[PDB]
Every structure is written in structure tokens, then in C-alpha cells.
Amino acid sequence: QGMSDAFTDVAKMKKIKEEIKAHEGQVVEMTLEKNRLGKLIEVYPSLFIVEFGDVEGDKQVNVYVESFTYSDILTEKNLIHYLD
Amino acid sequence: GMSDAFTDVAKMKKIKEEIKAHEGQVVEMTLENGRKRQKNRLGKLIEVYPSLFIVEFGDVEGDKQVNVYVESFTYSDILTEKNLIHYLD
């Protein structure tokens, strides 16, 4: 007895890409497996871009931009949560 | 001694101006290494931000590629000549 179809790499990757695209322009909470809030400023086919340091509740002196691959999420290197 | 045209402050101001002015248009870029430029690429300057800019490669006529991808660059990357850039009309 194993994780359902919902947890195959192909299913999970499909969901990750969908969820990221759907949240473009909105706030995300992200970790490095020190949590940060960022704005999802750009979403592209092979990468996405987050601006950190200027979200209310997580304001920092340094405002910077970081790119992530979808693999960063799939592999659980970085965890992401989509804030409404 | 090179003139004030080539001080870091001068060059940074010009880089930022040139990128801002060229948003939406085509750039030619290549990595600094030897005299004979290798693997030059054409891309569209699709976004300009305060700390960086974003180029889409692979869909410019004359340099079309199977894979279309974006890459971001800092203004420091250009200032320090890690990547070379030219603004095509």
C-alpha cells in the first residue's frame, strides 16, 4: 500500500506548475529545507521569480529577487505555500 | 588613465539607462572569455527591474531555437563584463 496517484512525480509536478501559475502576482511563504514571505513577481515555463523583503509582516532591509526552478519545489528543497 | 566615461559610477548609470530604454526590444548577448566571441545569442528584453533584467532567448528571428527560455541578469553582471550586451535597433 503506497501513496495514491496524487503523489506520483508527474501528478505532483503538474500541480506545482498549475499552482504557481495561478498565484502569479500574489504572496507566497517559502522555506529552505528562516521562512520568508515573498511576492511571486514572474512565472515562466522553466522558472519562477520571487521578490523577498517587501511583504508586510516580513519586511527586511534588503529587498531582493530570486529565481527558482519547479524542480526546487518538486524535490522539496524549498517548500511553498500560497497565501490569500 | 581611462576618462570618467569608464568609472564604475558613470558606466552603471549608462547601463541602467540603456536597459530601461531598450525594454521590449532585441539584445545580442555573449559570455566574456576570448577574442573570438562564441555562442552569441539574441533575445528579447522582456522585463526591467531595479536590481535586474530578464531576457527571453530562442524566439528572435534569425536566432530561433528549439528551446525558448528566460534568464535574468543583474546590472552588476554587465558592469563587471561577465556578460556582454548590445542593444539592436
Side-chain angles (χ1 to χ4, degrees), chain A residues 13-66:
Chain A
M13 189 54 128
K14 170 182 188 280
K15 183 57 147 168
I16 289 160
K17 288 181 172 268
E18 287 173 348
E19 284 177 324
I20 291 274
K21 190 192 170 268
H23 219 239
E24 178 176 353
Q26 307 186 241
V27 175
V28 294
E29 176 171 3
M30 295 187 66
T31 214
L32 176 43
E33 291 311 309
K34 163 167 288 92
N35 288 22
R36 288 175 291 178
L37 307 178
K39 307 182 188 190
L40 185 58
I41 59 170
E42 302 292 354
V43 177
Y44 302 108
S46 79
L47 69 96
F48 67 92
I49 304 186
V50 181
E51 182 198 278
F52 290 108
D54 215 24
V55 179
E56 179 169 18
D58 191 35
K59 292 274 191 175
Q60 303 295 334
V61 171
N62 289 265
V63 173
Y64 58 100
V65 174
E66 188 167 347

Short mmCIF file of all heavy atoms in Angstrom, two decimals, chain A residues 13-66:
data_model
loop_
_atom_site.label_atom_id
_atom_site.label_comp_id
_atom_site.label_asym_id
_atom_site.label_seq_id
_atom_site.Cartn_x
_atom_site.Cartn_y
_atom_site.Cartn_z
N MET A 13 4.17 17.35 -10.17
CA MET A 13 4.80 18.40 -10.98
C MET A 13 3.70 19.17 -11.74
O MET A 13 3.76 20.39 -11.85
CB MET A 13 5.86 17.85 -11.94
CG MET A 13 6.69 18.89 -12.65
SD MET A 13 7.52 20.13 -11.57
CE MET A 13 9.21 19.92 -12.23
N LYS A 14 2.70 18.45 -12.25
CA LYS A 14 1.59 19.11 -12.92
C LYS A 14 0.90 20.09 -12.02
O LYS A 14 0.69 21.26 -12.45
CB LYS A 14 0.59 18.08 -13.47
CG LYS A 14 -0.73 18.70 -13.97
CD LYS A 14 -1.65 17.54 -14.44
CE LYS A 14 -2.88 18.08 -15.14
NZ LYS A 14 -3.85 18.50 -14.15
N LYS A 15 0.59 19.67 -10.79
CA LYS A 15 0.00 20.53 -9.76
C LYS A 15 0.88 21.72 -9.39
O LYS A 15 0.37 22.84 -9.25
CB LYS A 15 -0.35 19.72 -8.49
CG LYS A 15 -1.03 20.50 -7.36
CD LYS A 15 -2.29 21.14 -7.88
CE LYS A 15 -3.43 21.23 -6.82
NZ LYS A 15 -4.49 22.16 -7.38
N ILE A 16 2.18 21.50 -9.26
CA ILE A 16 3.07 22.60 -8.85
C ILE A 16 3.06 23.68 -9.90
O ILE A 16 2.92 24.84 -9.60
CB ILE A 16 4.53 22.09 -8.67
CG1 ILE A 16 4.64 21.23 -7.43
CG2 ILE A 16 5.50 23.26 -8.65
CD1 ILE A 16 5.84 20.32 -7.42
N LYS A 17 3.20 23.28 -11.17
CA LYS A 17 3.20 24.27 -12.23
C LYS A 17 1.90 25.05 -12.31
O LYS A 17 1.89 26.28 -12.51
CB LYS A 17 3.55 23.59 -13.57
CG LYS A 17 5.00 23.19 -13.61
CD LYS A 17 5.40 22.51 -14.98
CE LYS A 17 6.91 22.30 -15.05
NZ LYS A 17 7.59 23.49 -15.72
N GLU A 18 0.81 24.33 -12.11
CA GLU A 18 -0.54 24.92 -12.13
C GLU A 18 -0.73 25.89 -11.01
O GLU A 18 -1.23 26.97 -11.23
CB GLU A 18 -1.62 23.84 -12.05
CG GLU A 18 -1.74 23.08 -13.34
CD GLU A 18 -2.69 21.88 -13.26
OE1 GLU A 18 -3.10 21.48 -12.14
OE2 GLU A 18 -3.04 21.31 -14.35
N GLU A 19 -0.30 25.50 -9.82
CA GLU A 19 -0.49 26.33 -8.64
C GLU A 19 0.34 27.62 -8.66
O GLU A 19 -0.15 28.68 -8.30
CB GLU A 19 -0.21 25.55 -7.36
CG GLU A 19 -1.28 24.60 -6.98
CD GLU A 19 -0.96 23.79 -5.76
OE1 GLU A 19 0.22 23.40 -5.56
OE2 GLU A 19 -1.92 23.47 -5.06
N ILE A 20 1.57 27.51 -9.12
CA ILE A 20 2.44 28.65 -9.28
C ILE A 20 1.89 29.62 -10.31
O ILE A 20 1.72 30.80 -10.03
CB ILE A 20 3.85 28.21 -9.66
CG1 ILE A 20 4.50 27.51 -8.46
CG2 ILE A 20 4.67 29.45 -10.15
CD1 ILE A 20 5.17 28.43 -7.48
N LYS A 21 1.46 29.10 -11.45
CA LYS A 21 0.90 29.97 -12.49
C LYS A 21 -0.33 30.69 -11.99
O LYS A 21 -0.50 31.91 -12.18
CB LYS A 21 0.60 29.16 -13.77
CG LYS A 21 0.25 30.03 -14.94
CD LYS A 21 -0.33 29.19 -16.12
CE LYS A 21 -0.93 30.08 -17.26
NZ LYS A 21 -2.43 30.38 -17.12
N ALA A 22 -1.16 29.98 -11.25
CA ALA A 22 -2.43 30.54 -10.82
C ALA A 22 -2.23 31.65 -9.77
O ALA A 22 -3.03 32.60 -9.69
CB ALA A 22 -3.38 29.45 -10.28
N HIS A 23 -1.14 31.56 -9.00
CA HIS A 23 -0.81 32.54 -7.99
C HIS A 23 0.06 33.72 -8.40
O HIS A 23 0.48 34.50 -7.54
CB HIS A 23 -0.12 31.83 -6.80
CG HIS A 23 -0.54 32.38 -5.48
ND1 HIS A 23 0.33 32.93 -4.55
CD2 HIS A 23 -1.77 32.48 -4.93
CE1 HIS A 23 -0.35 33.31 -3.48
NE2 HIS A 23 -1.63 33.03 -3.68
N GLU A 24 0.36 33.88 -9.70
CA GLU A 24 1.26 34.93 -10.15
C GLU A 24 0.76 36.27 -9.66
O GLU A 24 -0.43 36.56 -9.75
CB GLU A 24 1.41 34.91 -11.70
CG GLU A 24 2.31 36.02 -12.19
CD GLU A 24 2.59 36.00 -13.68
OE1 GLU A 24 2.19 35.04 -14.39
OE2 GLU A 24 3.20 37.00 -14.15
N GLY A 25 1.68 37.06 -9.11
CA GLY A 25 1.42 38.37 -8.54
C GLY A 25 1.07 38.40 -7.08
O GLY A 25 0.89 39.47 -6.51
N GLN A 26 0.83 37.23 -6.48
CA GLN A 26 0.38 37.15 -5.08
C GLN A 26 1.49 36.71 -4.14
O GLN A 26 2.60 36.49 -4.56
CB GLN A 26 -0.82 36.21 -4.96
CG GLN A 26 -1.92 36.64 -5.94
CD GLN A 26 -3.19 35.84 -5.76
OE1 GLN A 26 -3.65 35.15 -6.66
NE2 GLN A 26 -3.75 35.92 -4.57
N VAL A 27 1.19 36.68 -2.86
CA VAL A 27 2.24 36.39 -1.85
C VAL A 27 2.41 34.92 -1.58
O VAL A 27 1.43 34.13 -1.50
CB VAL A 27 1.90 37.09 -0.55
CG1 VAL A 27 2.90 36.70 0.55
CG2 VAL A 27 1.88 38.60 -0.73
N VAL A 28 3.66 34.52 -1.44
CA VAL A 28 3.99 33.15 -1.06
C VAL A 28 4.81 33.11 0.20
O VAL A 28 5.55 34.04 0.48
CB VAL A 28 4.75 32.41 -2.20
CG1 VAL A 28 3.81 32.23 -3.42
CG2 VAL A 28 6.10 33.09 -2.59
N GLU A 29 4.64 32.05 0.98
CA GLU A 29 5.57 31.73 2.04
C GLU A 29 6.49 30.61 1.57
O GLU A 29 6.02 29.59 1.08
CB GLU A 29 4.85 31.33 3.33
CG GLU A 29 5.83 30.88 4.41
CD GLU A 29 5.19 30.67 5.80
OE1 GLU A 29 3.96 30.82 5.88
OE2 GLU A 29 5.96 30.39 6.75
N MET A 30 7.79 30.78 1.75
CA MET A 30 8.74 29.76 1.27
C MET A 30 9.75 29.43 2.35
O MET A 30 10.15 30.27 3.18
CB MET A 30 9.46 30.19 -0.01
CG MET A 30 8.58 30.35 -1.24
SD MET A 30 9.46 30.69 -2.84
CE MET A 30 10.38 29.16 -3.15
N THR A 31 10.23 28.20 2.28
CA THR A 31 11.20 27.70 3.21
C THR A 31 12.46 27.27 2.46
O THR A 31 12.44 27.14 1.20
CB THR A 31 10.55 26.47 3.86
OG1 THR A 31 10.95 26.34 5.21
CG2 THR A 31 10.93 25.30 3.09
N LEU A 32 13.55 27.02 3.20
CA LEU A 32 14.72 26.28 2.68
C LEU A 32 14.98 25.07 3.60
O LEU A 32 15.39 25.25 4.75
CB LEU A 32 15.96 27.17 2.62
CG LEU A 32 17.29 26.52 2.19
CD1 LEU A 32 17.11 25.57 0.98
CD2 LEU A 32 18.36 27.61 1.91
N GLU A 33 14.75 23.86 3.10
CA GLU A 33 14.81 22.65 3.92
C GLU A 33 16.22 22.24 4.32
O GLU A 33 17.16 22.55 3.59
CB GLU A 33 14.12 21.50 3.19
CG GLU A 33 12.63 21.74 3.11
CD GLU A 33 12.08 22.12 4.48
OE1 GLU A 33 12.38 21.37 5.44
OE2 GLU A 33 11.38 23.17 4.59
N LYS A 34 13.65 30.73 9.36
CA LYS A 34 14.31 31.29 8.19
C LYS A 34 13.29 31.36 7.04
O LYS A 34 13.65 31.80 5.94
CB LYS A 34 15.56 30.44 7.86
CG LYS A 34 16.15 30.62 6.46
CD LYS A 34 17.56 29.98 6.29
CE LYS A 34 18.68 30.73 7.02
NZ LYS A 34 18.91 30.20 8.40
N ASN A 35 12.03 30.95 7.31
CA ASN A 35 10.90 31.12 6.39
C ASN A 35 10.82 32.58 5.95
O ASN A 35 11.22 33.50 6.69
CB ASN A 35 9.55 30.73 7.00
CG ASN A 35 9.39 29.23 7.17
OD1 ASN A 35 10.38 28.49 7.22
ND2 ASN A 35 8.16 28.76 7.12
N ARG A 36 10.35 32.78 4.74
CA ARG A 36 10.29 34.10 4.15
C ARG A 36 8.96 34.27 3.46
O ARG A 36 8.41 33.32 2.90
CB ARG A 36 11.40 34.29 3.12
CG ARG A 36 12.78 34.44 3.64
CD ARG A 36 13.72 34.49 2.40
NE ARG A 36 13.78 33.21 1.69
CZ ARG A 36 14.46 32.96 0.58
NH1 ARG A 36 15.16 33.93 -0.04
NH2 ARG A 36 14.42 31.73 0.06
N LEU A 37 8.44 35.49 3.47
CA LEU A 37 7.32 35.84 2.58
C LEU A 37 7.88 36.59 1.41
O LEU A 37 8.75 37.43 1.55
CB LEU A 37 6.29 36.71 3.28
CG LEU A 37 5.77 36.15 4.61
CD1 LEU A 37 4.80 37.11 5.22
CD2 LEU A 37 5.12 34.79 4.41
N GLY A 38 7.32 36.30 0.24
CA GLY A 38 7.71 36.97 -0.99
C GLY A 38 6.55 37.19 -1.92
O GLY A 38 5.50 36.60 -1.78
N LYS A 39 6.77 38.04 -2.91
CA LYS A 39 5.80 38.27 -3.95
C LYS A 39 6.20 37.49 -5.21
O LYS A 39 7.34 37.55 -5.68
CB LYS A 39 5.71 39.76 -4.28
CG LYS A 39 5.47 40.62 -3.10
CD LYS A 39 5.34 42.12 -3.50
CE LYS A 39 5.30 42.99 -2.23
NZ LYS A 39 4.93 44.39 -2.57
N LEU A 40 5.26 36.77 -5.76
CA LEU A 40 5.52 35.94 -6.96
C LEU A 40 5.44 36.84 -8.19
O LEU A 40 4.39 37.03 -8.78
CB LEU A 40 4.52 34.79 -7.00
CG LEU A 40 4.68 33.73 -8.08
CD1 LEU A 40 6.06 32.99 -8.08
CD2 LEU A 40 3.57 32.62 -7.91
N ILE A 41 6.55 37.46 -8.53
CA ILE A 41 6.53 38.56 -9.49
C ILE A 41 6.52 38.13 -10.97
O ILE A 41 6.02 38.90 -11.83
CB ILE A 41 7.63 39.60 -9.23
CG1 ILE A 41 9.02 39.00 -9.29
CG2 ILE A 41 7.31 40.33 -7.95
CD1 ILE A 41 10.18 40.05 -9.27
N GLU A 42 7.03 36.96 -11.27
CA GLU A 42 7.04 36.44 -12.65
C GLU A 42 6.91 34.93 -12.62
O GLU A 42 7.52 34.28 -11.75
CB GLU A 42 8.33 36.80 -13.40
CG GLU A 42 8.65 38.27 -13.51
CD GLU A 42 7.68 39.05 -14.42
OE1 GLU A 42 6.76 38.45 -15.12
OE2 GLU A 42 7.86 40.27 -14.44
N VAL A 43 6.22 34.35 -13.61
CA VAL A 43 6.14 32.90 -13.75
C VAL A 43 6.38 32.57 -15.22
O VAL A 43 5.74 33.17 -16.10
CB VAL A 43 4.77 32.38 -13.31
CG1 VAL A 43 4.67 30.81 -13.54
CG2 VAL A 43 4.61 32.67 -11.84
N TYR A 44 7.34 31.69 -15.46
CA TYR A 44 7.72 31.25 -16.81
C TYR A 44 7.68 29.75 -16.92
O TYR A 44 7.57 29.02 -15.94
CB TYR A 44 9.10 31.79 -17.14
CG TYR A 44 9.21 33.30 -17.06
CD1 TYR A 44 9.92 33.93 -16.03
CD2 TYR A 44 8.63 34.12 -18.02
CE1 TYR A 44 10.02 35.34 -15.98
CE2 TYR A 44 8.70 35.49 -17.96
CZ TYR A 44 9.41 36.11 -16.93
OH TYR A 44 9.50 37.50 -16.88
N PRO A 45 7.82 29.22 -18.15
CA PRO A 45 7.76 27.79 -18.34
C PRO A 45 8.77 26.95 -17.55
O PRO A 45 8.42 25.87 -17.11
CB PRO A 45 7.99 27.67 -19.86
CG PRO A 45 7.35 28.90 -20.39
CD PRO A 45 7.79 29.96 -19.43
N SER A 46 9.98 27.46 -17.33
CA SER A 46 11.04 26.72 -16.70
C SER A 46 11.51 27.29 -15.38
O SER A 46 12.44 26.75 -14.78
CB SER A 46 12.26 26.66 -17.61
OG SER A 46 13.01 27.89 -17.55
N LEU A 47 10.95 28.43 -15.00
CA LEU A 47 11.34 29.02 -13.75
C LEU A 47 10.32 30.03 -13.32
O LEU A 47 9.50 30.44 -14.08
CB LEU A 47 12.74 29.60 -13.84
CG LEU A 47 12.92 30.81 -14.69
CD1 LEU A 47 12.85 32.02 -13.87
CD2 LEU A 47 14.35 30.78 -15.39
N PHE A 48 10.42 30.42 -12.05
CA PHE A 48 9.61 31.46 -11.50
C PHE A 48 10.47 32.34 -10.59
O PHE A 48 11.57 31.96 -10.13
CB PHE A 48 8.34 30.88 -10.82
CG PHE A 48 8.61 30.05 -9.58
CD1 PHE A 48 8.62 30.64 -8.29
CD2 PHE A 48 8.86 28.69 -9.67
CE1 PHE A 48 8.83 29.86 -7.17
CE2 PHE A 48 9.05 27.91 -8.50
CZ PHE A 48 9.05 28.50 -7.28
N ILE A 49 9.98 33.54 -10.37
CA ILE A 49 10.75 34.61 -9.73
C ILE A 49 9.99 35.19 -8.55
O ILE A 49 8.84 35.57 -8.67
CB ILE A 49 11.14 35.68 -10.77
CG1 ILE A 49 11.90 34.99 -11.90
CG2 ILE A 49 12.03 36.76 -10.13
CD1 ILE A 49 12.48 35.92 -12.95
N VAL A 50 10.66 35.28 -7.41
CA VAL A 50 10.06 35.79 -6.20
C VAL A 50 10.87 37.00 -5.66
O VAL A 50 12.09 36.97 -5.63
CB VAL A 50 9.93 34.68 -5.11
CG1 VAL A 50 9.26 35.22 -3.80
CG2 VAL A 50 9.16 33.47 -5.63
N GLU A 51 10.16 38.05 -5.27
CA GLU A 51 10.79 39.22 -4.62
C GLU A 51 10.60 39.09 -3.11
O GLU A 51 9.45 38.92 -2.64
CB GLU A 51 10.09 40.47 -5.04
CG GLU A 51 10.71 41.77 -4.44
CD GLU A 51 9.70 42.91 -4.55
OE1 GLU A 51 9.59 43.53 -5.64
OE2 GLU A 51 8.96 43.15 -3.58
N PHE A 52 11.70 39.09 -2.39
CA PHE A 52 11.67 38.93 -0.93
C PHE A 52 12.05 40.24 -0.28
O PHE A 52 12.87 41.00 -0.86
CB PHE A 52 12.67 37.86 -0.49
CG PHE A 52 12.30 36.46 -0.87
CD1 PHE A 52 13.00 35.79 -1.89
CD2 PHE A 52 11.28 35.77 -0.20
CE1 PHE A 52 12.69 34.48 -2.22
CE2 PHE A 52 10.94 34.48 -0.58
CZ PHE A 52 11.64 33.83 -1.59
N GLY A 53 11.45 40.52 0.87
CA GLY A 53 11.88 41.59 1.74
C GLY A 53 10.90 42.73 1.84
O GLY A 53 11.03 43.64 2.70
N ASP A 54 9.90 42.74 0.98
CA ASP A 54 8.94 43.86 1.00
C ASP A 54 7.48 43.48 1.26
O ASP A 54 6.56 44.29 1.04
CB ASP A 54 9.06 44.64 -0.31
CG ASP A 54 8.83 46.17 -0.11
OD1 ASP A 54 9.02 46.71 1.02
OD2 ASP A 54 8.41 46.79 -1.09
N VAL A 55 7.25 42.30 1.79
CA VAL A 55 5.90 41.88 2.14
C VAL A 55 5.63 42.30 3.56
O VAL A 55 6.42 42.05 4.44
CB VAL A 55 5.72 40.34 2.02
CG1 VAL A 55 4.25 39.88 2.42
CG2 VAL A 55 6.02 39.90 0.59
N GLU A 56 4.49 42.95 3.79
CA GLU A 56 4.07 43.25 5.16
C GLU A 56 4.08 42.04 6.09
O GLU A 56 3.55 40.99 5.78
CB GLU A 56 2.68 43.93 5.12
CG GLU A 56 2.16 44.25 6.48
CD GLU A 56 0.94 45.15 6.44
OE1 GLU A 56 0.28 45.26 5.37
OE2 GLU A 56 0.66 45.74 7.50
N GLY A 57 4.73 42.18 7.24
CA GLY A 57 4.89 41.05 8.17
C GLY A 57 6.26 40.38 8.05
O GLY A 57 6.69 39.64 8.96
N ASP A 58 6.94 40.63 6.94
CA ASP A 58 8.28 40.10 6.72
C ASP A 58 9.15 41.11 6.01
O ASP A 58 9.95 40.77 5.13
CB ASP A 58 8.24 38.74 5.98
CG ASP A 58 9.60 38.03 5.97
OD1 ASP A 58 10.36 38.15 6.97
OD2 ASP A 58 9.96 37.37 4.95
N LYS A 59 9.02 42.38 6.39
CA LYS A 59 9.81 43.42 5.77
C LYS A 59 11.26 43.31 6.22
O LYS A 59 11.52 43.07 7.40
CB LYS A 59 9.29 44.79 6.19
CG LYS A 59 7.92 45.15 5.66
CD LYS A 59 7.92 45.74 4.31
CE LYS A 59 6.53 46.30 4.01
NZ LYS A 59 6.53 47.01 2.71
N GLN A 60 12.16 43.49 5.28
CA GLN A 60 13.59 43.39 5.54
C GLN A 60 14.29 44.62 5.01
O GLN A 60 13.77 45.31 4.11
CB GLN A 60 14.18 42.13 4.87
CG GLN A 60 13.47 40.80 5.31
CD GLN A 60 13.65 40.46 6.76
OE1 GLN A 60 14.64 40.87 7.42
NE2 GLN A 60 12.68 39.77 7.32
N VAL A 61 15.52 44.85 5.51
CA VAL A 61 16.33 45.94 4.98
C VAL A 61 16.64 45.70 3.48
O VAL A 61 16.58 46.64 2.70
CB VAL A 61 17.66 46.04 5.77
CG1 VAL A 61 18.63 47.03 5.08
CG2 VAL A 61 17.37 46.45 7.28
N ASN A 62 16.99 44.46 3.13
CA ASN A 62 17.42 44.05 1.77
C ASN A 62 16.20 43.51 1.05
O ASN A 62 15.59 42.53 1.52
CB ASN A 62 18.50 42.92 1.82
CG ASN A 62 19.88 43.40 2.33
OD1 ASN A 62 20.76 43.74 1.54
ND2 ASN A 62 20.08 43.39 3.65
N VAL A 63 15.83 44.14 -0.06
CA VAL A 63 14.75 43.62 -0.96
C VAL A 63 15.46 43.00 -2.15
O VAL A 63 16.29 43.68 -2.80
CB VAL A 63 13.79 44.74 -1.44
CG1 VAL A 63 12.77 44.21 -2.50
CG2 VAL A 63 13.08 45.35 -0.27
N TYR A 64 15.23 41.72 -2.40
CA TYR A 64 15.96 41.06 -3.47
C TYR A 64 15.06 40.13 -4.21
O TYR A 64 13.94 39.83 -3.77
CB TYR A 64 17.17 40.31 -2.95
CG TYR A 64 16.84 39.25 -1.92
CD1 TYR A 64 16.77 37.93 -2.28
CD2 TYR A 64 16.62 39.60 -0.58
CE1 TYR A 64 16.47 36.94 -1.34
CE2 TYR A 64 16.30 38.59 0.39
CZ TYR A 64 16.25 37.28 -0.02
OH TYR A 64 15.94 36.31 0.89
N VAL A 65 15.57 39.69 -5.34
CA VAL A 65 14.80 38.85 -6.24
C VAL A 65 15.56 37.58 -6.40
O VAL A 65 16.84 37.59 -6.53
CB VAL A 65 14.53 39.59 -7.57
CG1 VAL A 65 13.88 38.74 -8.55
CG2 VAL A 65 13.66 40.80 -7.33
N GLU A 66 14.85 36.47 -6.37
CA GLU A 66 15.44 35.15 -6.51
C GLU A 66 14.65 34.28 -7.48
O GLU A 66 13.43 34.30 -7.48
CB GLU A 66 15.49 34.47 -5.15
CG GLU A 66 16.25 33.17 -5.14
CD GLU A 66 16.54 32.70 -3.72
OE1 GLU A 66 16.37 33.50 -2.79
OE2 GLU A 66 16.92 31.53 -3.56
#
